[PDB]
Amino acid sequence: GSTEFLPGSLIDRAEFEAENRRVVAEGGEPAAGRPVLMGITKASLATDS
């Protein structure tokens, strides 16, 4: 919706919650998420650096 998140991506929980909370004001379209499980190789290849 208004969360500029590509559907089907993987997003860190803290950032997702922060963005949804910032968008709840002056808006009405929070994004929806579902918990996911990742391995120790694809979880360490998805780092920010």
Swiss-Prot record:
Induction: 6-fold repressed by starvation. Disulfide bonds: none annotated. DNA-dependent RNA polymerase catalyzes the transcription of DNA into RNA using the four ribonucleoside triphosphates as substrates. Belongs to the RNA polymerase beta' chain family. The RNAP catalytic core consists of 2 alpha, 1 beta, 1 beta' and 1 omega subunit. When a sigma factor is associated with the core the holoenzyme is formed, which can initiate transcription. This is DNA-directed RNA polymerase subunit beta'. The gene is rpoC. The chain holds residues 1171 to 1219 of 1316 of the full protein.
